[PDB]
């Protein structure tokens, strides 16, 4: 029985890895940002709400200008909002309705979306016809698209229901790159601010680190006790925190290769749908099934605020690349610009 | 099956040769990180409503 | 992405007439299509606007009332019914479209045209310096003069430069100050402030030579500056 | 507002005129989400009403149908499945001829599937179309097998009258809720050519009894 | 005093009638779940029975309490034509709430393809024109210190028929309908025991669209029935029928009741407006 020599090796290894980790947590951040002075309790009001999705709104994105933001429905639209002005920029329909993320290009030319089609859709924002037509339909998941992120306008890593991520070359179309370890579905991307590596959540509840050009895993994450809905690094890239369904924002650090800080309340039983940072990354805001996001001191796990005023639950949230704004979408087919 | 565990030890091998700093210094980094641009959060510091394009 | 323009040719002082441009090759129905006229030998004059669904029409205040403007979403035509035409109706006319949405390119793409002879408040866009001559290669400047600051409180100064190339219909170039337009090599730029602007060629060529014009879109009156051509 | 602003909030005028069009012509549709095991016979009930998830419309007595089948989505259920949150009804396929047959037992798999789907927290109100396909594939299997092999309690005669009551008990008696929703059990092999029929008699049945709900008369 | 524990009463009653209306407004307005058609309705129902308890019942009211008409002629004629135009506009959104669930009940593919708001749209714009149908004439020429309706019998058999007992007979009809396509409905060892749960349950459901329908129509009825028998019967009782003035009050402000109870029986009734107010 070879097998049983290689899960006894695997299983060595993991108590390796758990006692390398142990090493190195010689003091908790909690023990270390308890002279820094906490952010008391911030007033964020809804500046904007966007109105015009007629279902739950499962994914926004911000534009990289902090002004545009492309929200997907279940209604079939992808909407481009000016959240400045609350107009509606561009509403694009798609071919399938059932689009549960959407990512917004760095450089503004193209919006992604996918679902549970299984295709990433690219469309050209920017054409010389005053319409936006699908540039490029990424097949190649065999599960829901989750999430997706643009590298450029031709690079773009997708995560998948297939449990396997891909970075694609969208004008081949082809799977540049397929990033396979995860045995859960794979439900949240993000891109490093370097995009030079990502990390990606899935339902065994273990986030993974992948580096894009080589396309294999530096780290894996576990310490979550459910399916990770919700990833996002800390601005400088060398932390992230993840959203899992059981009321628990856990803060992981790339370099230490541990968890650093745990963001629960009991008083919170709902799961995380979405989670980001905010631009100094002192704030974790965190969407949740209770309806409202919450904000938290990112170094003190501290609820330092709450953006009550969803009617359903929040299903995105993403913060300007300015930090200016907050934009939470729901359920309730709402999208609140908050400040 | 032998293919898929093979497979897995390797990562995990692959994954524990990884230099781990403290987490006191890389609590420290994140710290250091939310000062250095406290100034450049209008989440933390509630911009006036002139600087706030949204009002 | 093609308008091409019908109707035209000589008409007697106090006819009617009616332009079409029969617009192929994009989403008609999502641009604010202009008519944008220019005299035998003058600058462009901009002459009315009809929105994306026809909602909202501007005509100029030398032909308002006088004349009309419709677009066949359908058929992907945009007509301009003219009446009572004036002998300061011989023009050049011009179809324009435009989409307006944040970061969008207005008066990118122009029709060829229709001659039209016809038989025997607002914002002054000055362009004090015309007919410029220069040398391939080398840099030119042209200025623009607003008799109002084009400058919105939103941020966007609402000034455009076009290039009536020769035989061709013109071409824009800078939309709103300092945004180069699709298409437009990276050597033209688009500066100014308030009410006075430039726009900078740094390394031009054969191509660039023409009619250079201003325009504004803060209000609607849309004026065009007095073209400043440039020559070899 | 400038200019270029107005028209900016024209555009997006006409696209909430547009996006409210769309709205309201998708709220006309009956939104069915068809369930089962592949090999359960969803493909043939597909056939009568005529990778990632399969858009089937029809149109039946005026009503616009769009069944959504999801059984090529092999991955997490419990992810994607809140989106038919708002669905009219399930149309869950099960093969009558399955109750020997093994992947588990292929019946227990679609008795536990549907147990799952019926008593789901998001389709607390949303009533299910049940399917039993391959009615006499499940004769000729009956008079020769006995249903005692899926079932051990069965206890009753192999004929096809009482193994088919005796397996829609065992599948109807999974719904829990029955308050808030039925269970619309209907028996096809590959040409009944009346199960989009049962469909719209069983969807006219669900909209009236949320109407009746409405009123307070249900 | 009588005159002060008059006023209380009234005053009250006109209160809460405001209140409850106004909350139904202000429920359908703010909260997005509540914008569908059959809310539209009650809405609308909420709208003209706040205009009763607005313009009409402080009126009447005073007209209680003082005894007398203290107004002009030309206010007392204002104030009969705006008591018949709210009063029969909110009969006949009883009514366009009866066809409206009858068409939801009977007809499910017009629910799904034609049921829209510019029906409920019509639907109160056609009880709202039914109203001034039965309130002008009056005031277009169909006729001291005490304000009356006109009592002419041509004008009575117009303004009681066309606004109660043709109301009364569609709402009966259409409820009766309602009531049988709503039974067929319901009547369309464990297995024993789970049938027994099944007739317990299609019984409860009976007896739910039993007392749904007692609790519209009795409302309904034992508010405005008393009234119109005695507005058709008195105006055709030349001295054999005399009204004692308090039985004629109470008669007169059943219907006010009405006004004040109808979101009661439509909307605080109702599981999306209570959850509704909760959220509030
Ligand atoms: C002015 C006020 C008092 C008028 C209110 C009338 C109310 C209190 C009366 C009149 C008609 C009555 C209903 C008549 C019919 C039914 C159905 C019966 O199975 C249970 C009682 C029930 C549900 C009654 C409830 C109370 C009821 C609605
Ligand atoms: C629960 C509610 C709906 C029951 C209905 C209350 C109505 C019918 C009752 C409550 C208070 C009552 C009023 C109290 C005082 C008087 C003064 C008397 O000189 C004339 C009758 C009059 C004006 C009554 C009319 C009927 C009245 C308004
Ligand atoms: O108490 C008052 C005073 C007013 C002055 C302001 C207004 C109240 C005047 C007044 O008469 N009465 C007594 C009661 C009138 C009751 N309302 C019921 C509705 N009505 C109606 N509805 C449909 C068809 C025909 N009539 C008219 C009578």
Redesign the interface.
Same mark, same amino acid.
């Given at each position: 029985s070879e097998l049983d020599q290689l899960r006894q090796e695997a299983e060595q290894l993991k108590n390796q890895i758990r006692d390398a980790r142990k090493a190195c947590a010689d003091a908790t951040l909690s023990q270390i940002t308890n002279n820094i002075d906490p952010v008391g309790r911030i007033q964020m009001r809804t500046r904007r709400t966007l109105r015009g999705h007629l279902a739950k709104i499962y994914a926004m994105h911000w534009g990289t200008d902090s002004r545009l933001l492309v929200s997907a429905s279940q209604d079939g639209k992808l909407i481009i909002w000016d959240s400045y002005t609350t107009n509606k920029v561009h509403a694009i329909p798609l071919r399938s309705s059932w689009v549960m993320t959407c990512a917004y290009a760095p450089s503004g030319n193209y919006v992604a979306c996918g679902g549970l089609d299984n295709i990433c859709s690219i469309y050209n924002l920017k054409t010389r016809e005053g319409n936006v037509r699908v540039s490029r339909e990424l097949a190649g998941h065999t599960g829901y698209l989750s999430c997706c992120r643009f590298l450029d306008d031709n690079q773009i890593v997708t995560s998948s229901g297939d449990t396997t991520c891909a970075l694609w070359d969208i004008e081949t179309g082809q799977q540049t790159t397929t990033f396979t370890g995860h045995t859960g579905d794979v439900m949240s991307l993000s891109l490093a601010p370097d995009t030079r590596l990502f990390v990606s959540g899935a339902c065994d509840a273990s986030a993974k680190l992948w580096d894009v050009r080589e396309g294999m895993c530096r780290q894996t994450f576990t310490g979550h006790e459910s399916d990770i809905n919700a990833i996002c690094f800390f601005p400088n890239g060398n932390a992230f925190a993840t959203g899992s369904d059981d009321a628990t924002c856990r803060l992981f650090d790339l370099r230490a290769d541990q968890e650093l800080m745990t963001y629960s309340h009991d008083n919170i039983i709902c799961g995380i749908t979405s989670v980001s940072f905010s631009k100094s990354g002192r704030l974790l805001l965190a969407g949740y099934d209770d309806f409202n996001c919450n904000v938290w001191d990112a170094l003190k796990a501290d609820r330092a605020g709450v953006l009550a005023g969803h009617?359903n639950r929040v299903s995105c949230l993403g913060v300007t690349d300015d930090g200016m704004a907050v934009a939470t979408g729901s359920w309730?087919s709402f999208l609140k610009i908050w400040n | 099956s032998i293919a898929q565990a093979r497979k897995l030890v390797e990562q995990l091998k692959m994954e524990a040769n990884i230099d781990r700093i403290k987490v006191s210094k890389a609590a420290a980094d994140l710290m250091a990180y939310c000062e250095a641009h406290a100034k450049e959060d209008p989440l933390l510091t509630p911009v006036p409503a002139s600087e706030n394009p949204f009002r | 992405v093609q308008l091409v323009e019908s109707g035209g040719g000589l008409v007697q002082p106090g006819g009617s007439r009616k332009l079409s441009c029969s617009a192929s090759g994009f989403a008609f129905s999502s641009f604010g299509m202009h008519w944008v006229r220019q005299a035998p030998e003058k600058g462009l004059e901009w002459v009315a606007y009809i929105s994306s669904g026809s909602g909202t029409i501007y005509y100029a205040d030398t032909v308002k009332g006088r004349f009309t403007i419709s677009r066949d979403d359908p058929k992907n035509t945009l007509f301009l019914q003219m009446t009572s035409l004036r002998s300061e109706d011989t023009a050049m006319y011009y179809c324009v479209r435009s989409i307006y949405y944040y970061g969008s390119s207005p008066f990118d793409f122009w029709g060829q045209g229709t001659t039209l002879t016809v038989s025997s408040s607002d914002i002054v866009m000055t362009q004090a310096t015309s007919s410029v001559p220069v040398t391939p290669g080398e840099s030119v400047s042209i200025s623009c003069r607003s008799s109002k600051s084009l400058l919105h409180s939103n941020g966007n100064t609402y000034l455009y430069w076009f290039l009536q190339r020769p035989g061709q219909s013109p071409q824009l170039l800078i939309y709103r100050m300092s945004n180069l337009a699709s298409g437009v090599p990276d050597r033209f730029s688009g500066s100014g402030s308030g009410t006075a602007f430039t726009l900078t060629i740094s390394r031009l060529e054969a191509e660039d030579v023409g009619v250079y014009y201003c325009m504004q879109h803060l209000e609607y009156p849309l004026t065009f500056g007095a073209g400043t051509k440039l020559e070899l | 507002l400038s200019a270029e602003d107005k028209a900016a909030v024209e555009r997006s005028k006409m696209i909430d005129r547009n996006l409210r069009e769309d709205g309201?012509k998708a709220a006309?549709e009956?939104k069915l989400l068809l369930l089962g095991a592949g090999e359960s016979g969803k493909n043939t009930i597909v056939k009568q009403m005529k990778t990632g998830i399969v858009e089937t419309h029809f149109t039946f007595?005026?009503?616009?149908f769009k069944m959504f089948d999801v059984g090529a989505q092999r991955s997490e259920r419990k992810k994607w499945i809140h989106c038919f949150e708002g669905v009219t009804a399930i149309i869950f396929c099960v093969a009558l001829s399955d109750y020997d047959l093994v992947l588990m037992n292929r019946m227990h798999a679609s008795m536990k599937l549907f147990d799952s789907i019926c008593n789901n927290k998001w389709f607390t109100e949303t009533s299910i179309i049940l399917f039993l396909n391959k009615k006499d594939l499940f004769e000729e299997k009956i008079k020769r097998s006995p249903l005692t092999i899926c079932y051990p309690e069965y206890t009753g005669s192999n004929t096809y009258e009482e193994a088919a009551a005796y397996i829609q =008990?065992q599948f109807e $008696?999974l719904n829990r809720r029955? $308050?808030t929703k039925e269970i619309y059990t209907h028996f096809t092999c590959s040409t009944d050519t009346k199960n989009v029929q049962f469909v719209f008699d069983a969807?006219?049945?669900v #909209? #009236?009894?949320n109407?009746?709900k409405? =009123?307070?008369?249900? | 005093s009588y005159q002060v524990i008059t006023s209380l009463l009234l005053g009250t009653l006109i209160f809460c009638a405001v209140l409850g209306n106004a909350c139904v407004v202000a429920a359908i307005a703010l909260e997005?779940?509540l914008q569908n058609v /059959?809310n539209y309705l009650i809405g609308s129902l909420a709208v003209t029975d706040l205009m009763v308890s607005v313009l009409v019942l402080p009126m009447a009211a005073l007209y209680q309490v003082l005894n007398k008409w203290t107004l002009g002629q030309v206010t007392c004629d204002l104030f009969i034509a705006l008591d018949v135009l709210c009063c029969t506009s909110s009969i006949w959104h009883l009514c366009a709430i009866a066809l409206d669930?009858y068409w /939801? *009940? &009977?007809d499910? *593919?017009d629910?799904?393809?034609k049921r &829209?708001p510019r029906r409920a749209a019509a639907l109160i714009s056609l009880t709202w024109l039914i109203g001034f149908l039965i309130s002008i004439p009056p005031m277009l020429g169909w006729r001291p210190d005490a304000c009356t309706i006109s009592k002419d019998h041509g004008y009575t058999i117009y303004s009681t028929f066309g606004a109660f007992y043709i109301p009364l007979l569609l709402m009966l009809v259409l409820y009766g309908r *309602?009531?049988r396509? /709503?039974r067929f409905? *319901?009547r369309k060892r464990?297995?024993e025991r789970?049938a027994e749960?099944?007739r317990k349950?299609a019984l409860a459901?009976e007896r739910? &669209?039993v007392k &749904?329908?007692g609790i519209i129509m009795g409302t309904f009825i034992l508010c405005w029935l008393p009234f119109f028998i005695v507005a058709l019967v008195l105006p055709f009782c030349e001295s054999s029928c005399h009204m004692p003035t308090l039985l004629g009050a109470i008669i007169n402000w059943l219907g006010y009741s009405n006004s004040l109870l109808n979101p009661v029986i439509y909307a605080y009734?109702?599981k999306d407006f209570q959850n509704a107010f909760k959220?509030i």
């Open positions: 009617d309730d | - | - | 309201e006309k009956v007595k005026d009503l616009y =008990c $008696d029955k $308050d969807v006219t049945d #909209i #009236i009894k109407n009746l409405e =009123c307070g008369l249900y | 997005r779940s /059959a669930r /939801a *009940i &009977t499910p *593919i629910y799904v393809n &829209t *309602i009531f396509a /709503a409905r *319901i464990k297995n789970n749960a099944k349950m459901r739910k &669209t &749904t329908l009734f109702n959220k």
